[PDB]
DNA sequence: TAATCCCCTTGGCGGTTAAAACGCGGGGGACAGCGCGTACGTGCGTTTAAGCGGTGCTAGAGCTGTCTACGA
DNA sequence: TCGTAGACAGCTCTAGCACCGCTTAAACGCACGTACGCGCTGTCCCCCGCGTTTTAACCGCCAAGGGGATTA
């Protein structure tokens, strides 16, 4: 029909989500990488179920207050579209990289 | 009556400020021979239309729809000059001074070979557009783009008027002068001076940047130096043009022609030019079918058109074996890319320091680690430009590398 | 031995305060303890939990609802003052995220 | 290196101390680590800043800032 | 003009070498137009600049048309004739260019000087009376001088004098104050007399209109008694009393015609009408906030209504717009408003008989301004400052029908209940 | 059913002090056990250093408290204090 | 094997809005991918010293309890 | 009191930070983040004091202060 | 503390629908440029209070007897 | 139920504590030219919006196994 004015959508993608916890990514495709990550380290090493899942549960929590400051580092620069200069002066704030 | 005159010292003015000639005279016209180029230029007495004495020389008009502005007389020309003419012309010289008013109520005519502006009856320029390079227009702009060729003292470069709205009208004669195969042409070129995505077909004498909204042009003369370079992530590539005179909008300068490329850049190309008439152009080199990286693979024509070396970026690996690192500068933090001879930042501005041009260079210090350095650099020409935020194995490669390129620190 | 009046007992709650100097003799933090000091923080541990539930509670009848879910627990710490820049570093399990929207980000 | 001087700092620094417990005495030495943990939470406390007015595209500096990186140093 | 003659020379003859030159003392440019040295008058000129790129400068002078005399009213006797707008010079160093550019702006600096814009009041008739209201320890601000003058006051039938040490006389009128007001220095650091003019009267350097006099009570020395404090009440109470008898001489002069109203320091607040949050208060009249430098004293009379601004969450500073009367007066904002304050100053509205708005929203005032200065009743076409309020917008659905949560529940819940102890 | 000392239990009482009738997560249950021993370690921890600093080897209630003014802000802080306080003195009582 | 883009996209997009943000920009993507797992690696690491540290074979959730205490980072309620 | 904080010796620090044109403002904003600095790392040393029944502040205070704090740096022996 | 095991992890999968990806249509928002007015930095007079040399000044940190009482 | 860390005096003594001059280097403020913040822009452009294809990730169901928990 109409295609949607802007931002509205997303305003109700937002208010569907800001109640929701659930994860966004799959258990298996996430998996993949992690095993495959973790033999670059050291073979032989098997996982349970439920460290996945509470690291699973742990990337996205990180990655999401990481959201948010960029965010702020938006409304900082006064544009609706997102900026990659953000995350590194983000991390040159929290110091993690360098 | 006497036969001639002669002045090996007065000048004429031609499109701005050009010096002397030599002034020969004759019962019929006028030889005016270049003291600087040998050029002989004739006028005869069936051309004689005006003369008016302004300050100081013969500024003559013919029919020739020539404006020979002839100066570096003394005042009293307006006599010796005319003791060789007074018996035919029928024309004396005014002691205008057309218009001092310094008011800039008039209106402009366009002359049939000149550009006249009048302030009630009382004139100030009648220009010929042999002294304009090119023109635009605008509301209320009108661009009259002056490139002088090469005079070391005071040369005009631009005059933009109001014009009203020229009611049913616009720039006509104005626009009505000298007209300033594509062998190649490109799709989708990522521009950043001008920013934007127009694109360049190659022209046999220059280049072109067809767009959307404006409209450029590339001459072969106006080149420096080929720049390529990289980004430092390896993801994008700098396509960089030293170029002199910058081109304008007549508020910004393009002194450096900016594209941005991706790695991506691969596809084959087809030039123009039959298989024999690409090596008699460019010689055993640039074939009519080549491929590759674009921005290797353009670059090796744009080499052939600027018949100039390659400006490489260098082996320096600074911080995490980058080739750069990025600096506060400028309303920005660009990147400093090392070379066999200078430094240039990117982005805006884009600014180039030659190796041998630096007077000195300095550092300033903070106390904490988070990139407390901050370097500046002097060059002999007295100028001297500051770069922050430099951290500590920063400061090892930087500093080894600078005393790799044996230059003056002041500590 | 005899009945087990217990010391928590003779504190009136509820934490097995013989079984937390029990946990305290295992980091064995140094070569003696006070009796009260088992006692003194199992009463505020029970005392601060016992506001957080009620913090709970209060968003459960935000939630108009009957199971306390982790989401309310963000709707407690993260709305709270002391325990949210207490806990700023703290991440939640499946607690959400608060509804944060930026007036920017509205129309005309 | 040092640009605090000491006395007017020093009597605003044991002007605190009796909104926590009045009555006390201090060292003169201690004073002098609070200058450098002082002025060790200016500099950096400034660098991000900088940055931010860099992002900010400014030569000058403002408030907000000031209030983001803290709130991105997790302060508030 | 520039000039007239051609025997109105320059003072060099510079076409013969080509050099750039300026004439003073008829104030004009000369240029070469291709050659073509021509004059022009600075009042035809707007300014220049420099860029160079090596040695290679380029001069670029600005020249008055409409675009720079005006924004394409006109002082300039052609509205549609063909103007130039700049020019722009190229040479090199092998250097004069720039310095005669530095000569450039003090001549705009010496026309503005001779031509200026150019309050005379009338004289004030000074009468040595039986009640001359005369005070001492007043300090003026603005002043004469940079430094901080001192002298005395003195009332008369027609208005005050401020006869300085030096006797320079300070001629105030009834009809030119607007607001006389009077704060005294109760936890104050002065007692001032404030007499808000309507005209900026010419006296020192400057014509000024927002004039206060002063008597300071501060306290801090940088050279337990309880004579200091009495001594500090002695030159707070037992001068105040006096004070309060100089206010009983002026309106023993004026019969309450030139009121000194009371300030309202229960509705005082410290906010930013001057974007600096000083002790503001309202009085019988005005609201204002002359208690430091410089007083903002609003006439409350010419206030259309009142727009309350960031009435929200999260904000203990809010503004608040000043909707005038005359909007050929610029709307102020008076900023950093404590919440707890917002229905004091709402009563103060209901005592200053205005129906006025919140909001939280914001726009360019100035556009509202040229919105409303076209017709005084055309932003009233517009629904009035109703445009202030919501009216929202038409869309699809907002979609939140199935807003529910997991129907398939977790059934963790009560764990056990069987469980022992030891010791 | 996984019988440890995870505590789960005083949790299942004192919500019914407050809130007779509310359902919990069992989650939430393990959130709050964790959190509790999450509490512990930076009493004990600090309370080690503190003993260390004055070199005394014993860890008495001022102890506790003293890091309990360092750990907890405010009015929450001291009515933990005046619990901790009346139970301490309880058991004084016995 | 290129499972570094097992992250779509769109679930991408949706970490984006439960992130809150407005507009979306395609550059981003490889960017977060790249903060991602390289902050994973961090804690996988020493992570892998704990299993090691209790000399077994298979990787369980104590373990990531002592790498948030090197992280700062703890959530709660998982140990088991 | 806080009004000591001259706007020079802001300014030197500013330029220490490398900043050049500054705000008004930001000098009687500092100020206060000056206190919230201070009031963390002196209550703890109050406490430290009243821990160890003392009349007088150490640097030990400040030493173990800064390590709640996360704020530690070193250079008199520590 | 060496056997024992059962209580956890795994290779690839039958099914098939909600989710991932390219693209067509079109539209939404950065952005460098044009002024244009403006406030903090520089030069400088002025204050002037602060670092330091010196006073008199006394109450608090420190370790040694001691014998003991709450943790072990 | 034997034990030793530490609170209660006690001496030492000394690290500060509060001022008065010297003087002398550091901050306040007046005046001012200006580099830079700010409003309107216009132009191109880069994701919505499905459209369509696809496609692969997850439940029911299979056995295979394996290594850490669990018992004197």
Same mark, same amino acid.
């Given at each position: 029909?109409?295609? !949607? ?11 569907? !989500? ?34 996945? *899942?509470?690291?699973?549960?742990? +990337?996205?929590? !990180? ?9 702020? +580092? ?8 997102? *900026? ?15 | ?39 002989? =230029? ?91 390079? @090119? ?14 060729? =090469? ?84 993801? @994008? ?6 170029? =002199? ?110 190796? =041998? ?55 | ?39 003194? #923080? ?10 957080? #539930? ?55 | ?26 060292? $003169? $030495? ?47 | ?423 | ?22 359902? &919990? ?5 393990? &959130? ?10 930076? &009493? ?51 | ?80």
């Amino acid at each position: 029909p109409h295609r !949607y004015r802007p931002g509205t959508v997303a305003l109700r993608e937002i208010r569907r !989500y800001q109640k929701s916890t659930e994860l966004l990514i799959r258990k298996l495709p996430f998996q993949r990488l992690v095993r495959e990550i973790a033999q670059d380290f050291k073979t032989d090493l098997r996982f349970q179920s439920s460290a996945v *899942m509470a690291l699973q549960e742990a +990337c996205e929590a !990180y990655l999401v207050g990481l959201f948010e400051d960029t965010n702020l +580092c938006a409304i900082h620069a006064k544009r609706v579209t997102i *900026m990659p200069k953000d995350i590194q002066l983000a991390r040159r704030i929290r110091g993690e990289r360098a | 009556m006497a036969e001639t005159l002669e002045f090996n010292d007065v000048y004429q003015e031609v499109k701005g400020s050009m010096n002397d000639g030599r002034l020969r005279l004759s019962r019929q016209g006028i030889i005016f021979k270049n003291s600087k180029t040998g050029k002989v =230029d004739n006028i005869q007495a069936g051309e004689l239309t005006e003369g008016i004495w302004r300050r100081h020389g013969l500024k003559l008009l013919t029919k020739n729809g020539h404006v020979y502005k002839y100066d570096g007389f003394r005042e009293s020309e307006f006599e010796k000059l005319s003791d060789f003419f007074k018996t035919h012309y029928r024309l004396e010289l005014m002691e205008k001074d057309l218009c001092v008013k310094g008011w800039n109520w008039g209106t402009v005519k366009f002359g049939g070979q000149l550009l006249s502006f009048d302030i009630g009856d009382q004139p100030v320029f009648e220009i010929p557009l042999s002294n304009v390079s @090119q023109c635009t227009t605008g509301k209320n702009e009108v661009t009259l783009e002056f490139h002088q060729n =090469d005079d070391a003292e005071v040369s005009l470069m631009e005059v933009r008027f109001y014009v009203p709205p020229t009611q049913x009208x616009x720039x006509x004669x104005x626009x009505x002068x000298x007209x300033x195969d594509a062998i190649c042409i490109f799709r989708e070129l990522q521009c950043l001076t001008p920013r934007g995505r127009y694109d360049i077909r190659i022209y046999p004498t220059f280049l072109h940047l067809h767009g959307k909204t404006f409209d450029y042009k590339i001459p072969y003369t106006t080149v420096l130096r080929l720049f390529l370079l990289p980004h430092k992530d390896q993801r @994008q590539m700098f396509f960089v043009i030293s170029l =002199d005179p910058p081109i304008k909008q007549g508020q910004t300068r393009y002194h450096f022609l900016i594209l941005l490329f991706s790695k991506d850049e691969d596809i084959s190309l087809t030039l123009n030019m039959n298989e024999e008439e690409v090596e008699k152009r460019f010689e055993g080199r640039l074939t009519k079918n080549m491929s590759g990286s674009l921005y290797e693979m353009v670059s090796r024509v744009m080499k052939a058109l600027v018949n100039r070396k390659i400006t490489v970026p260098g082996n320096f690996q600074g911080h995490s074996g980058a080739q750069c690192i990025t600096c506060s500068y400028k309303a920005s933090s660009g990147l400093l890319y090392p070379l066999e001879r200078g430094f240039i930042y990117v982005h805006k501005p884009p600014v180039h320091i030659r190796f =041998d041009e630096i007077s000195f260079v300095n550092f300033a210090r903070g106390t904490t680690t988070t990139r407390s350095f901050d370097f500046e650099i002097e060059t002999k020409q007295g100028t001297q430009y500051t770069f922050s935020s430099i951290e500590r194995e920063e400061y090892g490669k930087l500093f080894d590398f600078v005393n790799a390129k044996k230059l003056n620190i002041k500590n | 031995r005899a009945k087990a009046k217990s010391r928590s007992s003779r504190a009136g709650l509820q934490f097995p305060v013989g079984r937390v100097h029990r946990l305290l003799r295992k980091g064995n933090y140094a070569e003696r303890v006070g009796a009260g000091a088992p006692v003194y #923080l199992a009463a505020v541990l029970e005392y601060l939990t016992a506001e957080i #539930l009620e913090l709970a509670g209060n968003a459960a009848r935000d939630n108009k609802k009957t199971r306390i879910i982790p989401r309310h627990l963000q709707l407690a710490i993260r709305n709270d003052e002391e325990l949210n820049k207490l806990l700023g570093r703290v991440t939640i399990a499946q607690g959400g995220v608060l509804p944060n929207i930026q007036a920017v980000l509205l129309p005309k | 290196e040092l640009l605090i001087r000491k006395l007017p700092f020093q009597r605003l620094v044991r002007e605190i101390a009796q909104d926590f417990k009045t009555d006390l005495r201090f060292q $003169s $030495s201690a004073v002098m680590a609070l200058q450098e943990a002082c002025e060790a939470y200016l500099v950096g406390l400034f660098e991000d800043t900088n940055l931010c007015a860099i992002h900010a595209k400014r030569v000058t500096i403002m408030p907000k800032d000031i209030q983001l990186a803290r709130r991105i140093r997790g302060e508030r | 003009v520039s000039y007239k003659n051609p025997s109105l020379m320059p003072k060099e003859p510079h076409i013969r070498e080509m050099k750039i030159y300026i004439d003073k003392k008829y104030e004009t440019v000369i240029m070469p137009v291709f050659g073509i040295a021509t004059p022009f008058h600075i009042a035809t000129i707007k300014n220049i600049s420099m860029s160079v790129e090596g040695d290679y400068t380029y001069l670029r002078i600005n020249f008055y048309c409409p675009g720079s005399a005006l924004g394409r009213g006109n002082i300039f006797p052609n509205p549609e004739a063909t103007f130039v707008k700049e020019i722009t010079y190229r040479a090199s160093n092998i250097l004069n260019l720039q310095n005669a550019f530095r000569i450039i702006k003090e001549v705009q600096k010496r026309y503005k000087x001779x031509x200026x814009x150019x309050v005379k009041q009338d004289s004030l008739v000074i009468n040595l009376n039986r009640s001359n209201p005369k005070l001492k320890d007043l300090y003026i601000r603005p002043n004469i001088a940079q430094k901080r003058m001192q002298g005395s006051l003195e009332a008369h039938v027609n208005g005050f004098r401020f006869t300085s040490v030096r006797g320079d006389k300070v001629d105030i009128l009834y009809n030119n104050i607007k607001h006389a007001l009077f704060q005294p220095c109760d936890g104050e650091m002065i007692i001032v007399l404030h007499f808000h003019l309507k005209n900026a009267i010419m006296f020192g350097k400057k014509r000024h209109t927002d004039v206060q006099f002063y008597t300071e009570v501060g306290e801090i020395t940088t050279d337990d008694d309880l004579y200091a404090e009495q001594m500090e009440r002695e030159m707070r109470h037992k001068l105040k009393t006096a004070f309060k008898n100089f206010i009983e001489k002026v309106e023993a002069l004026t019969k309450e015609e030139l009121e000194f109203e009371v300030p309202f320091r229960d509705l005082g607040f410290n906010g930013a009408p001057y974007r600096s949050t000083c002790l503001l208060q309202p009085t019988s009249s005005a609201l204002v906030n002359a208690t430091e430098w410089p007083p903002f004293v609003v006439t409350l009379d010419e206030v259309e209504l009142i727009h309350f601004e960031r009435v929200q969450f999260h904000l203990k500073n809010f503004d608040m717009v000043i909707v005038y009367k005359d909007y050929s007066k610029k709307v102020t904002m008076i900023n950093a408003i404590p919440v707890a304050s917002l229905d004091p100053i709402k009563e103060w509205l209901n005592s200053c008989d205005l129906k006025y708005t919140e909001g939280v929203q914001s726009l360019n005032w100035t556009k509202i301004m040229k919105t409303i200065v076209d017709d005084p009743e055309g932003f009233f076409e517009q629904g009035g400052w109703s445009f202030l309020x919501x009216x929202x917008x038409x869309x699809x659905x907002x979609x939140x029908x199935x807003x529910x949560x997991x129907x398939x529940x977790x059934x963790x819940x009560x764990x056990x209940x069987x469980x022992x102890x030891x010791x | 059913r996984s019988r440890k000392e995870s505590y789960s239990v005083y949790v299942y009482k004192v919500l019914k002090q407050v809130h007779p009738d509310t359902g &919990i997560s069992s989650k939430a249950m393990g &959130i709050m056990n964790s959190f509790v021993n999450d509490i512990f370690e930076r &009493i004990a921890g600090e309370a080690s250093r503190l003993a260390h600093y004055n070199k005394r080897s014993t860890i008495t209630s001022r102890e506790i408290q003293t890091a309990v003014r360092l750990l907890l802000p405010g009015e929450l802080a001291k009515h933990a204090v005046s619990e901790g306080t009346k139970a301490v003195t309880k058991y004084t009582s016995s | 094997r290129d499972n570094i883009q097992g992250i779509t996209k769109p679930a991408i997009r949706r970490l984006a809005r439960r992130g809150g943000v407005k507009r979306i920009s395609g550059l981003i993507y490889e960017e977060t991918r790249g903060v991602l797992k390289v902050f994973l690696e961090n804690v996988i690491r020493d992570a892998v010293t704990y299993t090691e540290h209790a000399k077994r074979k298979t990787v369980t959730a104590m373990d990531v309890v002592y790498a948030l205490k090197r992280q700062g980072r703890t959530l709660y309620g998982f140990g088991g």
